[PDB]
Design a protein around this ligand. Sequence first.
Ligand code: NAP
Ligand code: RK4
Ligand code: CO
Ligand code: CO
Length: 159
Amino acid sequence: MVGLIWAQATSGVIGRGGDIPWRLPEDQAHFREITMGHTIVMGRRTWDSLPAKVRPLPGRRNVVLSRQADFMASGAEVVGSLEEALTSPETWVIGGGQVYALALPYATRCEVTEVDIGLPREAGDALAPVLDETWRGETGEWRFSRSGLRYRLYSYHRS
Ligand SMILES: NC(=O)c1ccc[n+]([C@@H]2O[C@H](COP(=O)([O-])OP(=O)(O)OC[C@H]3O[C@@H](n4cnc5c(N)ncnc54)[C@H](OP(=O)(O)O)[C@@H]3O)[C@@H](O)[C@H]2O)c1
Ligand SMILES: O=C(O)c1cccc(CN2CCCCC2)c1
Ligand SMILES: [Co+2]
Ligand SMILES: [Co+2]
């Protein structure tokens, strides 16, 4: 089971300036519950985006993808191809835009949070992958976050 997990604005934006341009604490709790115990795979920019206090993410096998042969990630395995990163019964690809694009052909599930903010796509933004017809989705109810934002969860699958 290779899965992808991300949160996006309706427009598809997931990242900007090395950060996520919103906060949604219920989504972090959801992210932790889905990924905990498993292997997590991330691009080097996403690893750099985690504050040192939170990296590696606890209780998970952290794997970082870089083309730098000598890249060091204290607390994580570093691999040179996505295919080398995928492990064991369950791996979650946790970002960012480049690594989601690379991992989608190997993915069976996507767990997606849609954040209802009118955040327009800007040049240089990291974007979520677009899911074609092979994906089947189940739509959750809209909810309101402690942060003030409206959001809903999608669970996508394919066989
Ligand atoms: N759910 C979310 O909303 C969410 C989740 C995670 C991240 N983000 C955001 O996403 C943004 C970062 O996404 P990104 O797309 O800019 O960078 P990224 O995908 O996180 O990492 C990009 C890096 O991965 C490595 N890489 C890419 N293709 C590779 C390949 N084929 N083989 C080996 N290594 C490869 C390179 O690292 P080297 O340059 O070291 O070779 C490349 O610079 C940030 O803003 C972050 O906050 C959002
Ligand atoms: O699971 C956790 O414990 C945790 C800790 C810090 C942040 C997050 C949310 N995500 C994680 C991967 C993309 C960047 C932001 C989760
Ligand atoms: Co699990
Ligand atoms: Co299945």
